[PDB]
Scaffold this active site. Sequence first.
Site, short mmCIF file in Angstrom:
data_model
loop_
_atom_site.label_atom_id
_atom_site.label_comp_id
_atom_site.label_asym_id
_atom_site.label_seq_id
_atom_site.Cartn_x
_atom_site.Cartn_y
_atom_site.Cartn_z
N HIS A 44 0.81 -1.20 0.00
CA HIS A 44 0.00 0.00 0.00
C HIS A 44 0.85 1.26 0.00
O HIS A 44 0.66 2.16 0.82
CB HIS A 44 -0.91 -0.04 1.22
CG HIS A 44 -2.08 0.88 1.13
ND1 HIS A 44 -3.31 0.57 1.67
CD2 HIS A 44 -2.22 2.11 0.56
CE1 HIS A 44 -4.15 1.56 1.44
NE2 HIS A 44 -3.52 2.51 0.78
N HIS A 100 2.40 4.78 -1.63
CA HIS A 100 2.07 5.94 -2.45
C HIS A 100 3.46 6.46 -2.79
O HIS A 100 4.23 6.78 -1.88
CB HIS A 100 1.34 7.01 -1.62
CG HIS A 100 -0.09 6.69 -1.34
ND1 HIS A 100 -1.13 7.34 -1.96
CD2 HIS A 100 -0.65 5.80 -0.49
CE1 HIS A 100 -2.28 6.87 -1.50
NE2 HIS A 100 -2.01 5.94 -0.60
N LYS A 129 -5.46 -0.10 -9.03
CA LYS A 129 -6.04 0.43 -7.82
C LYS A 129 -7.32 1.17 -8.13
O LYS A 129 -7.35 2.00 -9.04
CB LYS A 129 -5.06 1.37 -7.13
CG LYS A 129 -5.67 2.30 -6.10
CD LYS A 129 -6.20 1.52 -4.92
CE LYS A 129 -6.69 2.45 -3.83
NZ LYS A 129 -5.58 3.07 -3.05
N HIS A 143 -9.87 3.66 -6.59
CA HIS A 143 -9.99 4.62 -5.51
C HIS A 143 -11.21 5.52 -5.70
O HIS A 143 -11.42 6.06 -6.79
CB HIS A 143 -8.73 5.47 -5.50
CG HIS A 143 -8.46 6.12 -4.19
ND1 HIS A 143 -9.10 7.27 -3.79
CD2 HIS A 143 -7.62 5.79 -3.19
CE1 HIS A 143 -8.68 7.61 -2.59
NE2 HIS A 143 -7.77 6.73 -2.20
N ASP A 172 -11.69 8.52 -5.00
CA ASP A 172 -11.35 9.86 -5.48
C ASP A 172 -11.37 9.90 -7.00
O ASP A 172 -11.52 10.97 -7.58
CB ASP A 172 -9.98 10.30 -4.95
CG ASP A 172 -9.99 10.59 -3.47
OD1 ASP A 172 -10.89 10.09 -2.75
OD2 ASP A 172 -9.08 11.31 -2.99
N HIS A 215 -10.48 0.70 -2.71
CA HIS A 215 -10.74 1.70 -1.67
C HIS A 215 -12.13 2.15 -2.13
O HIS A 215 -12.27 2.96 -3.05
CB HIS A 215 -9.74 2.85 -1.74
CG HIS A 215 -10.07 3.99 -0.84
ND1 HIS A 215 -9.11 4.78 -0.24
CD2 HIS A 215 -11.26 4.52 -0.46
CE1 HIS A 215 -9.69 5.73 0.46
NE2 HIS A 215 -11.00 5.60 0.34
N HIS A 226 -7.49 -0.84 3.84
CA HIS A 226 -8.01 -0.33 5.12
C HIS A 226 -9.44 -0.78 5.35
O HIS A 226 -10.35 0.04 5.46
CB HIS A 226 -7.92 1.21 5.20
CG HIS A 226 -8.03 1.89 3.87
ND1 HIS A 226 -9.19 1.90 3.13
CD2 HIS A 226 -7.11 2.54 3.12
CE1 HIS A 226 -8.98 2.52 1.98
NE2 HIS A 226 -7.72 2.91 1.95
N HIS A 248 -6.90 13.58 1.29
CA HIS A 248 -7.86 13.58 0.19
C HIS A 248 -8.24 14.93 -0.42
O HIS A 248 -9.19 15.00 -1.21
CB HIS A 248 -9.11 12.81 0.59
CG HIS A 248 -8.84 11.37 0.90
ND1 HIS A 248 -8.33 10.49 -0.03
CD2 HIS A 248 -8.95 10.67 2.06
CE1 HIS A 248 -8.13 9.31 0.54
NE2 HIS A 248 -8.50 9.40 1.81
N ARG A 297 -16.05 8.89 8.80
CA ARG A 297 -15.00 7.91 8.58
C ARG A 297 -14.29 7.43 9.85
O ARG A 297 -13.78 6.31 9.89
CB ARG A 297 -13.97 8.48 7.62
CG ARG A 297 -13.88 7.74 6.32
CD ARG A 297 -13.19 8.58 5.29
NE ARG A 297 -11.80 8.19 5.07
CZ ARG A 297 -11.14 8.42 3.94
NH1 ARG A 297 -11.73 9.04 2.92
NH2 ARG A 297 -9.87 8.07 3.84
N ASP A 306 0.40 2.64 3.77
CA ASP A 306 -0.45 3.64 3.08
C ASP A 306 0.43 4.89 3.21
O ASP A 306 -0.03 5.96 3.62
CB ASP A 306 -1.81 3.81 3.78
CG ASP A 306 -2.79 4.64 2.97
OD1 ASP A 306 -2.43 5.08 1.85
OD2 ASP A 306 -3.93 4.87 3.45
#
Lengths: 101, 566, 566, 566, 100, 100
Positions: D133, D135, D216, D218, D220, D245, D271, D319, D335, D359
């Site tokens: 995970h 980035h 991935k 996501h 977003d 995600h 997560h 985010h 969250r 992450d």
Amino acid sequence: MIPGEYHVKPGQIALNTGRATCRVVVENHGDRPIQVGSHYHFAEVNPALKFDRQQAAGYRLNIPAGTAVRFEPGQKREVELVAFAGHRAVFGFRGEVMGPL
Amino acid sequence: SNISRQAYADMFGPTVGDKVRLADTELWIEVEDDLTTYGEEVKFGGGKVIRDGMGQGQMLAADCVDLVLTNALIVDHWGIVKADIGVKDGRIFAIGKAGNPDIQPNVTIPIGAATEVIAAEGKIVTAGGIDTHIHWICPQQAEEALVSGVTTMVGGGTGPAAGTHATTCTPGPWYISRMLQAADSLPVNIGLLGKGNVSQPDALREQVAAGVIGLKIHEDWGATPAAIDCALTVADEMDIQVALHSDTLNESGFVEDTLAAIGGRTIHTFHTEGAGGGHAPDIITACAHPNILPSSTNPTLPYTLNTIDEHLDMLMVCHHLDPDIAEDVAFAESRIRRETIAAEDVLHDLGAFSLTSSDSQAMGRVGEVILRTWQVAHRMKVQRGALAEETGDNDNFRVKRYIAKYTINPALTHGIAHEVGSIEVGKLADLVVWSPAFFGVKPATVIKGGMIAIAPMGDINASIPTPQPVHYRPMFGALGSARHHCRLTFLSQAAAANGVAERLNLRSAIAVVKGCRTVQKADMVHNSLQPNITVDAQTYEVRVDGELITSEPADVLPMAQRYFLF
Amino acid sequence: SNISRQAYADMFGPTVGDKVRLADTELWIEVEDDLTTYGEEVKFGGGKVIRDGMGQGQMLAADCVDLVLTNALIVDHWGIVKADIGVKDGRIFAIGKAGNPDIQPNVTIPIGAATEVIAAEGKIVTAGGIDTHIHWICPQQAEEALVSGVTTMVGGGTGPAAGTHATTCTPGPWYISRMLQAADSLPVNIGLLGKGNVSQPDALREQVAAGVIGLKIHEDWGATPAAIDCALTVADEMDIQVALHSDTLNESGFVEDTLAAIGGRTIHTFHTEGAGGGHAPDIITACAHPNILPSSTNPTLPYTLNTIDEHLDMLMVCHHLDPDIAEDVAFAESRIRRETIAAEDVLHDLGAFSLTSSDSQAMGRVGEVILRTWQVAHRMKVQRGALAEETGDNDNFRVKRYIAKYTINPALTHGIAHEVGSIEVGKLADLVVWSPAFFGVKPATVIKGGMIAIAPMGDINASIPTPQPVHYRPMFGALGSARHHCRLTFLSQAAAANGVAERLNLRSAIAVVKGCRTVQKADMVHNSLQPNITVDAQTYEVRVDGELITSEPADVLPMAQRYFLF
Amino acid sequence: SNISRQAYADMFGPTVGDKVRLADTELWIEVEDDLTTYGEEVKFGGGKVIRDGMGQGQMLAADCVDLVLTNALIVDHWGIVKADIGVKDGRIFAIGKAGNPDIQPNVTIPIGAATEVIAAEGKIVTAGGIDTHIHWICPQQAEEALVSGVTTMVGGGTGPAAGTHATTCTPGPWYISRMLQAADSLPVNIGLLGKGNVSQPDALREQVAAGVIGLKIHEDWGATPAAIDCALTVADEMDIQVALHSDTLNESGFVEDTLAAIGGRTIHTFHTEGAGGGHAPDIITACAHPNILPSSTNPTLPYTLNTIDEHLDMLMVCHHLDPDIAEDVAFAESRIRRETIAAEDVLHDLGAFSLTSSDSQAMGRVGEVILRTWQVAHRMKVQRGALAEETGDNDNFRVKRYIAKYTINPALTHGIAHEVGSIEVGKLADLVVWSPAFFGVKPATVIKGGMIAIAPMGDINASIPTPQPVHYRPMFGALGSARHHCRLTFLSQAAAANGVAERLNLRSAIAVVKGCRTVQKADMVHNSLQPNITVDAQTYEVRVDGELITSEPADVLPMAQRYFLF
Amino acid sequence: MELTPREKDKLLLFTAALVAERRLARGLKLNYPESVALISAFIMEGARDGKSVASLMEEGRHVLTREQVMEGVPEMIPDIQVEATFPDGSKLVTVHNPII
Amino acid sequence: MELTPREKDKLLLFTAALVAERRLARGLKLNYPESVALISAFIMEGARDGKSVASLMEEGRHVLTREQVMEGVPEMIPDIQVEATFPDGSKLVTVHNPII
């Protein structure tokens, strides 16, 4: 004196001018909250939101880009929609259109 | 629906008519245009616009950009406008409206699965700077310069050796070859200059054939009429630039003799004011000629209270002069003149001086080319008010004139404007992102060839990238092969033809220089003035059309003690 | 015209008959010769000599040097003279008079457009040092060593692993191959040693075929007569060197047995004093043999007041010994003898010990090989006065004897003297420039293969390169491909023939070793003595020809607290 | 002869039945087996066993190992045993009894001239960790992770750009190609993930064809049923993994809808607790499915006193959410739930959550994946006692369950378990050596592909490698070509077939991923539970089979203030 | 903070000066590197304070004396040069023969 | 010591704070980097001491005031974030509008 300060002239900005809009009463019948984004094809939102899906076909929320509208469980509220432009072709979301309309 | 302008600027950055203060200076810019369609701006984040079927399309890689800079406020020689920037293949693809043609209007920069995004709303975006007066005294200079926003460095040297300490020359084919090889390790575009002080042409031709994009004529190597003439002749043949640092001693003649040797051919004059070098005390009269492309080094920009005191010893160390030796000091002293140092700032504001550069570690500061350019702009706005070209209540034109000095003008002068120099389609994606509060001081992002090369980065082990300590650290754009692919090594047409890149096994992208002989003063963007300038032989007074040109020394400057720890 | 000698030394450095103090020691050198022609010295700077048509000629690159070191005071095994040094193609081209044949007399080192200059007037120039006792425990050792003036490092290891912590062996073809590949990233010349402790010859031959230039025999791997003999046999076949660290435990025999195994064949003995290893307590008797090339590690050079206290634990950690285990400590203790530690310094002064080395991070300090060599020279001048070979009121011969210890002798001993080891024409340009006040301590410039690789560098953003903070930073000579081109990876003749460089895709220049079996004690420059030395079995007293050899422990040394921050 | 167990453990490390405390936690491990033959253990040093003719043989390289880890206490998913580890060709050759078959019994790992040794007696040895995970916000993350014991990093990004700040996606063929090239400069195994949020399959296929090993999805980028379905379809075709995600806003549907889109196909949920992302507030119910491979990010492991306060702003920055904007904060708040944060720790102990990951710099800490895993194990032993599977008075099974979480399980989930993931023969030699007092905190040695890549190293100029200051420094395993040879770049089968490595001229070893579609919850070593879990829509209470699952927040944790300077 | 390389480099000068500062406080005679660091850091704080270049070129000669440093040190330092951000940008200060 | 990169990095934060600390002690108005370093280091010592995240989020707003810093500095710092090892592992502290 403030480093890099903006000097914004006062006034307002009219958004999505010239396009078709329409109002719709939406009711969250789900037990969990749902929040819709400014460009999501409304007719394909979470199935827990109850409303006239037929009128919202090819429409999105008439809110400033990037913002959102929230609906708590059981909430009822009237929102304003605005018609999609460009090619008016919809691909994605819940996979209901996947083409022009 | 409807949104107030203030909340609008908070989300998407300022729009038409809104003004923004550049750092802590008195300079204000005003958005002249916005290429968006209100309500259709693209924004990234949870619930935002850039999402499958919405602000992002279904197009294949070939039909969308690789990187998009959303909601940027561009500041370039051609305008100060708000728009989205699209980058494809390491080059600027378009400047307009990004989004999904499927559901959005006027999309010119398509976003897709293959599209990465950099959120530039609330940020000013500029092209990467270009410094044409580098002394390669140490490899560490490239990072310092990159961190300040300069993406291209032209100059010469072999390292911390006397020759390079004083002159920007990379002596001979061997050293040239070696520096071209070492250049692949640097995260900036590079082009070398050879030693042009020779009366035999073939000795220059080899250097150009070996790889240099220009020839530096320096008085320390002997800046004689014969040498000058030889270099310009080779220059005309091979389409390369000649950078000159004339005879301060007046040993072989005066400025009018050097000018006679030049014979009206194109040439770039270094530190045209003269504190850094040139015929004493009127080498500044050069800027009145059509074939002269004049630039300034930075220690004298702008005229402040400590400028003069600081200059004497700086001069002694750079050129290897002996303070005990009388003639070495008389020389050193005739070079520093408060009169010309003051006139220089005005001449820049009037557009008589077209370039600004460092002269790295040789009477110049590599990380201060941009910073000092704006300090002069500020000091001139404060002392002289608005320019005759200005319109509206802003300093837009003065900013376009000053930005052109370390971007497009240096690029045209060295024949690389076809690859870099500004934010125009087709050019290499060398961009710098700035928060308005730190404009010209410390950048938010430095992008090399479409890849972030250096940026401020906080705690590596933190949960977000913002926790302290935050300091500039190298990024992927500066790593191994990713770097080679994102940087350019500028060669001379002869060298590119001879296969120098293949023989030396250079790994970075290659660009070739051209159009060095055709540029003239008239071609310098916003800085093409040719004034009837004079200098008094004893009083050193600079006069243009008779009126006295002068300015007062600043005691405090912006972009200084508010930003630096030391 | 006429100039006083004092002002003369101030401009061009000292001339014949002038003396210079080496750092803060009591050693003085006297210029024995000056190869210049008074009034025709070349000097660089504004108005100086090296300028087009004057001190610089009109010759093409092929007819002039690439780099010239002006007015240097050379200190080498063959002389201490003032001259100009010419470098071409990364190699020493000439040692003489630089300039322009067109207008100057006796020019032997032509200067042209392609010539770069390093001003060495007032500076002492030496060849780069060579350390043949490196433990590759960490890559960081190369920088430390380079900064101190050592340009070639020979030894072995795979990193911070037990084997390497104790022995200088690079075990097997895989590790050898790997280290040869990693060597390209280091800014120093490198040659590896394999583990020579094996009784089966083919196991050694593969290692030599894989790339090693020598075989290290270490007691930790078992330094038995059988093993020793096997290694020397392979050595004789393949022309590689054997470095030995004998059996301290006397487990397989005494020094006379090990010596019998050696059978009169050429061999390099490590820490011949024995505190670092070797038959207890008379491994020092080895230096009396013609086939023995004896060297010392540095912690014991010179004998000071804290030497003994510091040694016990240093010994325990290096060889993985257990302080609780009685025999591990009895051993540890029998190795440290004040008597031999004292004798060692004298033996170096007499020329009985020919080499000095570090034994990096394994009872040795990688950045102190040079520094300690001069500390012994100073302490011996102070205790014993002038050598029998000296002439005049200077310490010239003692300096030539001591410099040879970390330059030419290590080079002859390992069969690389044909490429490096001293300042002679044709050899690689590995040079070190020093200000006399910092001789042997901190260098002004470290040149690798004709390119400055590391040097002291001040503020990167300053107007000159001298502002603080000034500390050693990597230069272009140490960057990517420029480094590969400026460094050598020494291979064995078998490996070079087998195409090991092609198979491993090594990028650096390649040199091959030869003449390892032919060297003898007689060949060690200025250090060829073979004394009738004895050691008492209990008192450990060292005696030469009966007379007692000993020295007193220094309490304060030069090149120490006056130069280091810590 | 005879030796007491205490002195035995002091020389060769603990044996069968002996217990060792893991760092300063309450976890104890007990040696389950010892593969040695008492009295025949191999040990290195002066006078020790590993010496020619004794513990070392006469075999050629091909018949002995390259490196041997002597007397190690292995801790892996399959056992906690004492043995010697043999490494050959960068891969684990054997796990057993090292020595010389000539004079020793039961030797299975032969030692010879070509054998290097690492003394691991008194040390715990583990496989290198795997974080799926990542980035890629900065290249600096690889060192931080390597130093903590993680040898493989999977994830995505292009650097400090918005997209990567929030999502683990490497957008498009260009960026993918660029990151694959930059990966050669990193001292860790790497595999990239592309942006899988697209409804058109061909846009995903290019990314897989370009080099990514996974996709991935996501929120977003829009985590819609249509997008999810498209990605899984391409995944099934190309044998790559999908990391999800989910939609926290419940915008396109609830968890049961996302789960319906997934359609029972294999998928790795990020997560799975949800504080880091996923359907609010019951994305945790996913771990009850056979096709779901659930992992946790680290900021929530374990539940401590400051966890909640720290989370709100961490969420906002990652985010790109606006704290002024109401909906951006309501979201941010829904969250973070104390209930699920508490349940998560128990679920890990029960084996319902199979993976732990960072992450990195996006609500996760790159150097704390291992450290936090053990902090949860400790907190669960303290709160719940022994597991039902435990036997004897030790925590062996709990340790095997927890170690599997950042080693073998992440490896099976991403189809790279055939190359790395554990200490088994044939796998790449990615090992970590730890002193028991620093287990999981700071490593003694980090070995990459058979070469030490990073380790604690003291003074570079010291006489031994132990003097202060001791801090992690890069080793040979991390240098140039030695690194390429010791690291893997994981490609997709399509990319490996298309010659992506040849076209991009990648230099590191290449591995291909496979078996991503076949893995299920049942395959997760020691973590294969599928509980009847429920979450209350308002109270957020997590229940398994009705019984309440919860835990108390720790106020002080081990592996914290006793080891870190800051 | 957004520290650039030049800011981080000066942090080394500052720290080195802390070293010299304490030793001087113990009454030790400073060596070469301690002396340079100490006088150098002084000048940098001088600029932060806003003092002029001309003033510092003078004040810099009164930080240490021949009696507070090791033998030979004063002659090992013919001048000291440092650059710092003055209220009017960066400036070079040169102190000739700082120790007498 | 076995210092990891993150520990060595924080050493830079600490040293930078020493710089700001002295200047503040001289009575100077701190600039941008000095202010961030100073407030930041305070929080790190707060964690070492064992104080809670919630407490530091509050204490961090009382290190400096609008009157002790240069003009424009307070608005150049909308928040400050630092991570340190608390008795219960690493935690992120965010101080909003630290200077008022």
